[model samples]
Target: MYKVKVYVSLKESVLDPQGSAVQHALHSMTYNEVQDVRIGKYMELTIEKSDRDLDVLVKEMCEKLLANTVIEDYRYEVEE
Candidate 1:
């Protein structure tokens, strides 16, 4: 079996309203040193052992459904 960890986040050029809200809340709570914040998604996937290239498979999954390439970027780690 294989364990896959995926991270998906907005591109720098994209505005993240949710992240901004969280930053504002932190600043209100005396966390004034906070400069910026960005929100993202984390996903874990399990795949059975296969001869297929893990890198290609993961990239396909990310591009096809895991992330929106237009405004977001994705990266993943795989472990046995």
Candidate 2:
């Protein structure tokens, strides 16, 4: 079995409106020291043992469906 943690986030080149919203909210709450806030997705995938290349498997999944390549990026960590 394999344990995977995937993080997906917006490309910095793309503008983040929701990020601005959170920054403003934090400042309002007296978190004036806040520089910025960006929202993202964290996913945990548990997979049974497979007869395939692990790195290739993860990348394939991400490219095919997990991450939207045009506007977002993704990375994963594998745990034994």
Candidate 3:
């Protein structure tokens, strides 16, 4: 068995409203050094097969449903 971890984050030019709100809250709490904040998505998937084909398929999944290539960037890791 293998487990996959996916992390998705917004592109550099994109804005993150939720992260901005959190940054404001942090500043209100006296963490004024917080210049910018960005929120992202994470997912863990378990695969029954452990093979190179599985790796290719999961990479495809990341490109398709896990991340939007235009507006976001993604990276994934697998554990055996």
For each candidate, what TM-score against the reference? Answer: 0.89, 0.87, 0.86
Predictions in order: lDDT: 0.92, 0.89, 0.90
Collision count for each candidate, in order: 0, 0, 0
For model 2, residues 27-77, the per-residue Cα lDDT tens digits are 999999989888888999997767889888888898888899988998899
lDDT for 57 in candidate 1 is 86
Q: How accurate is candidate 1 locally (lDDT)?
A: 0.92
The runs of at least 3 residues in candidate 2 whose Cα sits more than 4 Å from the true structure, single-residue gaps closed, are none
lDDT of 1 by residue, 25-44 (tens): 99999898999999999999
TM-score of candidate 2 versus the correct structure, residues matched by position: 0.87
Candidate 3 positional error at 78, Å: 1.2
Model 3, range 1-80, lDDT digits (tens) per residue? 87989999999899999999999999999999999989999999988874559768887988898888899998889888
Best by lDDT: 1
Q: Give me the runs in candidate 1 sitting further than 4 Å from their true place.
A: 50-52
